[PDB]
Amino acid sequence: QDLKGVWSELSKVWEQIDQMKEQPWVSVQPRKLRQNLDALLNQLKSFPARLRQYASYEFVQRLLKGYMKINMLVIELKSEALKDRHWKQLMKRLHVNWVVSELTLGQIWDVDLQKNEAIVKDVLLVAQGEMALEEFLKQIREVWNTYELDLVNYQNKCRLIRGWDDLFNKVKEHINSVSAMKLSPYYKVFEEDALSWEDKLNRIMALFDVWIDVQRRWVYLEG
Amino acid sequence: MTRWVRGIFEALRPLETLPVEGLIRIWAHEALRLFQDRLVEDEERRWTDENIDTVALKHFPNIDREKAMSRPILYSNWLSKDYIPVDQEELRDYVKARLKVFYEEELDVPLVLFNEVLDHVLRIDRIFRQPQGHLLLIGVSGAGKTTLSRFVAWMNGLSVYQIKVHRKYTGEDFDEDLRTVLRRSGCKNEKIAFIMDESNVLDSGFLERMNTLLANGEVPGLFEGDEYATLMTQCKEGAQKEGLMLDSHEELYKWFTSQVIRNLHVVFTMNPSSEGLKDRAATSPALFNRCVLNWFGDWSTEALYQVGKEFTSKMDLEKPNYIVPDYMPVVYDKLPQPPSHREAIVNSCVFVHQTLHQANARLAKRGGRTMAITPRHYLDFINHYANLFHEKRSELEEQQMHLNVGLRKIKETVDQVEELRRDAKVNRSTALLKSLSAERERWEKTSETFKNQMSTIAGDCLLSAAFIAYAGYFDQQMRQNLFTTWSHHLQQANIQFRTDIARTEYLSNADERLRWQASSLPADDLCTENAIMLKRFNRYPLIIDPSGQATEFIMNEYKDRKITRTSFLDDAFRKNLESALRFGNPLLVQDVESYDPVLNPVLNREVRRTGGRVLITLGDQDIDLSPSFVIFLSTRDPTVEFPPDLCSRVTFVNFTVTRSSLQSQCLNEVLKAERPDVDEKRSDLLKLQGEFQLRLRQLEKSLLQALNEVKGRILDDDTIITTLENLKREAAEVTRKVEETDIVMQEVETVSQQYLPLSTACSSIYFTMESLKQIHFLYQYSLQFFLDIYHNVLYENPNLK
Ligand SMILES: Nc1ncnc2c1ncn2[C@@H]1O[C@H](COP(=O)(O)OP(=O)(O)O)[C@@H](O)[C@H]1O
């Protein structure tokens, strides 16, 4: 009858839901997931109103509606700033036990993202801050592992060094930034690296401050 | 006229059979797209529009002018092909679909499709589909120049590329940027949308190279030496890809020139300025000869109405009890008759925008200093309206839920006390029952008041948003005039709002004001209103103050959030910026008159969320962004004029004392130090708008919390009714205050009117002392000085004893 038909349609919809929930979270594409959700919306709306008035159909429709409204939650979560420390921390807060290698969208969809929006957004903001700090560390590493002295010949007797101003400004910028790292409580991650960079930058500052004086005095006395 | 003939020929080439009506239609379309395109005001636009049909009919009689010209003249190849004329609605649907696809692709911010925006999109699309189709836009900031240019470029497959300017932006950086864009365009056969604003155009050094690039099709001499050899090597590869093997350097160089001309469209976005545009013409003729002109300024009333209608879909604003007023105040001529509440409120918003145009024009006529008003201010105003409406509705709903929960708890407790009475104590129990019933009636009355506030919320929110977003630059008197005009307009439309609404009270509470007063903030009304503006903002505020109290106040307010100081003039400005934007702390900035255009991405709030990382592009360097970043721009000079581009990206907070602000301050001081009873009655009147209500709600919440601990022990002496007697006497006091508010406002007005002349004299004396500097450089006096005389007069005066 009509009840049997709507039960069969519900079983088909649930099977499709299970099928795409079997996709591991590593291999899930948020845009394709949203497109599949919209396709299910179109398929469900194609059902007759008599089948649409059933309570189970309404429950599945509102569950999918929750899924689309948390699709942007998933998109934010499907970043690279999460690392794994933030994921473990939100495991601890949510008191759920999953496997990173075996992680799929199904378990996270079972967890009420809407009920835990505040915690999820806080974790996302924490991850963004930590990723920003680590990205600045990467940037400083790449700019100091590639910086070269602008050597230039001098009277064919030696090869002096110029560009003091730009190098001093760069070092001052970096040392001010690393000094400012101590605040912004997200600094409680990656501490020894920041201290090592600060120490090496202070060494560079002292060495080159002595070096410029030595150079000017030597060139004056040479003349 | 040769471009006229070229366009007509291009339109006629795909087609083979046309009646005279089609030919005249194409002629008129090209006339519209070439002549009236560059027109500025409306009068000459209508002149050109009528003279086109005059000429067409005079030189072509015996033709049906209805089909020959239609008022919505439009041509495109998007519907079908072959540049067939299309109707407005079909192309509107097509552009809606394509803009939806764009939304899923980039620029999630919504767009509203009125007639002007669609016409501009069509014009830009026509210009792009042309060899050496360079384009120049002249229109007020925020009218949709860069946005529409980017949208049309993307829809054509034209990859956008814009240069980010900053301080010490040397000509060599611009040369490198041109080398990069030329390599991307000509060598790789990748079409480029090269979109320049006016900030980087200010320097004439780049303008000469841009002039040569526009005119010749490519600047000679941008590639020289080793980079020239790399260009030749990559051009060999490019010619290999096209199967056009060429060996000699000049031959493949001119092929590269042809590729650049075919695959490079430059779009310029200039803020309209007669002297600025004249200077631009002086330094370059290509911006008017080789560059076609498109003008579109302030949004029309239709555009503003549709933008408001689309941006006000989400909040309810359905009031079924709304009655259409007789003589509806209408600024939109296509307003539905009879209109519902939503049409009325959006029309009121459009009226607010238009009346601020009128007020700015009047103030310019008076000879004062005017800040430009742009549609970005309108969008910020609608965002403030939506945010405040959602917040206030949520607060009222939560308060109603709390009242319902309290009522249910009271019902349970009455049932429990009846059961405990079932078993001198009985007299106390009966007294408790009667007191609880009276408190229930008070609950019902408070529910009625809640319904009244729910009725008022829409108009109250509209006025609050209009004040907080639009105003702020004007003085206290002008702010009051604008607020009174808006209130009068809302009264005309029968939009429910409290007639005695106070801006300071409605948009804050007690603890925020106490915190502000803890920091170096005077109790002046202008200071309180501008602190309100400083608390809530979508665009980062610009603070102007001749006194400097603003910097100290905002330093103290954000001291716990490691806020720091930085001015534009120093060389540490860029590094302080980068620090603030990356580590997530506020950055108060001073001396804004020497504005650095590098802040444009920051003010625009245009961020890119890609690869698990939000990036804000400062100059040529991509910088990560922290959510806890608020930036404040400040200046000490109060008479400096700002470019409208900056004027349209920040909200103005004004602290300059004026003849009305100082008069109000002195009058308030007189009331405080001379008639303390009148001052405290005025303070009670001000606090009646919620503060007394909030204290009553908090006290009854405490009563509910205490009643939760019942366990039969509430009948220790069978009279816990002392707390509810305290509540009852407090409610009686506040009810008396509400009932007699009319006599209170009357007596406050009388006393203020009596004490007004002293305040006026104080203002005149202080401004004379301030103006004493023109007689002699020696005669310099400060506001604090006049305040010292004022206190020596009010207090420690032997004569008054
Ligand atoms: N039709 C529209 N509907 C909604 N918002 C719009 C519309 N046109 C423009 N906007 C908004 O106004 C802004 C226009 O900026 P734009 O004028 O391109 O900057 P510029 O003045 O630097 O060229 C955009 O941020 C966009 O969000």
Which residue type is seen at A142? Answer: E
Distances from the Cα of B512 to the Cα of B507, B516, B528, B532, B587, angstroms? 10, 6, 10, 9, 21
SS3 call for B85: strand
Residues 6+ apart with CB under 8 A from B534: B541, B543, B554, B632, B653
B588 conformational bin, left if phi > 0, alpha if psi -120 to 50, beta if neither: beta
A130-148 b/e (C-beta count within 10 Å ≥ 16 → b): bbbbbbbbebbeeeeeeee
Structure-block tokens of residue B300: 């029309």
Identify the CA nearest to B148 among candidates B292, B269, B310.
B269
Spatial contact of A43 and A90, defined as CB atoms under 8 Å apart: no
Q: What is the DSSP letter of A24?
A: B
Q: CA torsion, points B681, B685, B691, B694, in degrees to nearest 10?
A: 110
The DSSP annotation for B298-349 comes to: SPPHHHHHHHHHHHTSSS----TT--PPSS---S-TT--SS--HHHHHHHHH
Which chain B residue's Cα is nearest to A135? B624
Identify the CA nearest to B655 among candidates B545, B737, B781, B541.
B545
Identify the CA nearest to B268 among candidates B323, B367, B194.
B194
3-state secondary structure A111-131: CCCCCCHHHHHHHHHHHHHHH
Which residue type is seen at B325? Answer: P
Distances from the Cα of B223 to the Cα of A42, B176, B177, B246, angstroms? 56, 9, 12, 19
Give, using CA atoms, the residue closest to atom 12 of ligand 1. Answer: B142
Structure-block tokens of residue B568: 């534009």
* Edge-to-edge strands, sheet with B542-544: B564-567, B587-590, B631-635, B542-544, B652-654
CA separation for the pair B574, A16 (Å, rounded): 54
Q: What is the DSSP letter of B787?
A: H
Structure-block tokens of residue B297: 């300024």
Residue with tokens 């929960």, as numbered in its chain: B405
3-state secondary structure B404-442: HHHHHHHHHHHHHHHHHHHCCHHHHHHHHHHHHHHHHHH
Give, using CA atoms, the residue closest to atom 27 of ligand 1. Answer: B109
CA separation for the pair B620, B599 (Å, rounded): 13
> Cα B549–B551–B554 angle (5° rounding)?
105
CA separation for the pair B134, B284 (Å, rounded): 14
Identify the CA nearest to B470 among candidates B358, B394, B587.
B358
| H or E element that contains B504 | helix B503-506
SS3 call for A60: helix
CA separation for the pair B35, B29 (Å, rounded): 10
CA separation for the pair B573, A143 (Å, rounded): 21
Residues 6+ apart with CB under 8 A from B800: none
Spatial contact of A200 and A208, defined as CB atoms under 8 Å apart: no
Q: What is the DSSP letter of B598?
A: G
Identify the CA nearest to B289 among candidates B595, B620, B564, B38.
B38
CA separation for the pair B249, A155 (Å, rounded): 38
Identify the CA nearest to B487 among candidates B507, B468, B457, B459.
B459
CA separation for the pair B527, B507 (Å, rounded): 14
Which residue type is seen at A151? Answer: L
Spatial contact of B331 and B301, defined as CB atoms under 8 Å apart: yes
The phi and psi torsions of B13 (rounded to 5 degrees) equal -65, -55
Residue B139 marked as a ligand binder:
yes
Structure-block tokens of residue B387: 């945010």
* Edge-to-edge strands, sheet with B608-609: B608-609, B614-618, B621-624
Residue with tokens 């302030």, as numbered in its chain: B298
- Best of B168, B170, B578, B583 to disrupt the A interface by mutation (most A CBs within 10 Å)? B583
* Residues paired with B567 in a beta bridge: B590
CA separation for the pair B500, B690 (Å, rounded): 13
The phi and psi torsions of A145 (rounded to 5 degrees) equal -90, -5
A27-37 b/e (C-beta count within 10 Å ≥ 16 → b): ebeeeebbeee
* Edge-to-edge strands, sheet with B265-270: B159-162, B192-196, B265-270, B135-138, B292-295
Residue ranges of E strands in B413-571: 542-544, 564-567
Angle (deg, nearest 10), helices B691-708 and B375-422: 40
Structure-block tokens of residue B260: 């650049």
User: Does A169 sit within 8 Å of B624, measured CB to CB?
Assistant: no
| H or E element that contains B236 | helix B226-241
The phi and psi torsions of B544 (rounded to 5 degrees) equal -115, 135
Give distance in angstroms: CA of B299 to centre of ligand 1.
11
Structure-block tokens of residue B228: 């020239």
Residue ranges of E strands in B604-659: 608-609, 614-618, 621-624, 631-635, 652-654
Residue A176 is nearest to which of B579, B612, B627, comparing CB atoms? B579
CA separation for the pair A27, B21 (Å, rounded): 59
CA separation for the pair B538, A74 (Å, rounded): 26
B243 conformational bin, left if phi > 0, alpha if psi -120 to 50, beta if neither: left
CA separation for the pair B428, B430 (Å, rounded): 5
| Sign, Cα dihedral of B4, B10, B16, B18 | negative
Q: CA torsion, points A79, A82, A87, A93, in degrees to nearest 10?
A: -100
Asked if residue B627 has a cis previous peptide bond (ω within 30° of 0), the answer is: no
Identify the CA nearest to B714 among candidates B495, B504, B459, B412.
B412
Residue B612 is nearest to which of A80, A181, A183, comparing CB atoms? A80
User: Does B624 sit within 8 Å of A132, measured CB to CB?
Assistant: yes
Residue B484: how many other CB atoms lie within 10 Å:
10
CA separation for the pair B377, B353 (Å, rounded): 9
Method: cryo-EM
User: Does A184 sit within 8 Å of B585, measured CB to CB?
Assistant: yes
Ligand 1 contact via B267 beta carbon (within 6 Å): no
Give distance in angstroms: CA of B140 to centre of ligand 1.
11
The bridge status of strand B542-544 relative to strand B564-567 is unpaired
SS3 call for A152: strand
SS3 call for B744: helix
SS3 call for B279: helix
Which residue type is seen at A109? Answer: W
Spatial contact of B198 and B271, defined as CB atoms under 8 Å apart: yes
Residue ranges of E strands in A111-191: 151-154, 158-161
Residue with tokens 């999460």, as numbered in its chain: A82
Identify the CA nearest to B695 among candidates B722, B723, B731, B739.
B731
The bridge status of strand B621-624 relative to strand B292-295 is unpaired
Structure-block tokens of residue B196: 């320049």
| Contacts made by residues B764-769, CB under 8 angstroms, sequence distance 24+ | B764/B659, B766/B662, B767/B659, B767/B662
Distances from the Cα of A62 to the Cα of A41, A56, A69, B7, angstroms? 11, 10, 10, 55
Residue B582 is nearest to which of A80, A125, A132, comparing CB atoms? A132
CA separation for the pair B184, B234 (Å, rounded): 11
Q: Rounded to 5, what percent of chain A is helix, strand, coil?
A: 75, 5, 25
Q: What is the DSSP letter of A25?
A: G
Spatial contact of B140 and B299, defined as CB atoms under 8 Å apart: no
Cβ-based burial of B443 (10 A; exposed 0-12, middle 13-18, buried ≥19): middle
B189 conformational bin, left if phi > 0, alpha if psi -120 to 50, beta if neither: left
Q: What is the DSSP letter of B622?
A: E
CA separation for the pair B472, B478 (Å, rounded): 10
Spatial contact of B593 and B637, defined as CB atoms under 8 Å apart: yes
Cβ-based burial of A18 (10 A; exposed 0-12, middle 13-18, buried ≥19): exposed
CA separation for the pair B350, B307 (Å, rounded): 10
Spatial contact of B608 and B101, defined as CB atoms under 8 Å apart: no
Residue B196: how many other CB atoms lie within 10 Å:
18
Q: CA torsion, points B699, B701, B706, B707, in degrees to nearest 10?
A: 120
SS3 call for B763: helix
CA separation for the pair B103, B125 (Å, rounded): 19
User: Does A129 sit within 8 Å of B584, measured CB to CB?
Assistant: yes
Residue B611: how many other CB atoms lie within 10 Å:
10
The phi and psi torsions of B408 (rounded to 5 degrees) equal -65, -40
Structure-block tokens of residue A145: 């592992």
> Cα B327–B331–B332 angle (5° rounding)?
105
Residue B763: how many other CB atoms lie within 10 Å:
22
The phi and psi torsions of B159 (rounded to 5 degrees) equal -75, 125
CA separation for the pair B419, B194 (Å, rounded): 82
Residue B140 marked as a ligand binder:
yes
User: Does B624 sit within 8 Å of A136, measured CB to CB?
Assistant: yes
The resolution, in angstroms to one decimal, equals 3.7
Which chain B residue's Cα is nearest to A129? B626
Spatial contact of A201 and A171, defined as CB atoms under 8 Å apart: yes
- Best of A79, A83, A84 to disrupt the B interface by mutation (most B CBs within 10 Å)? A79
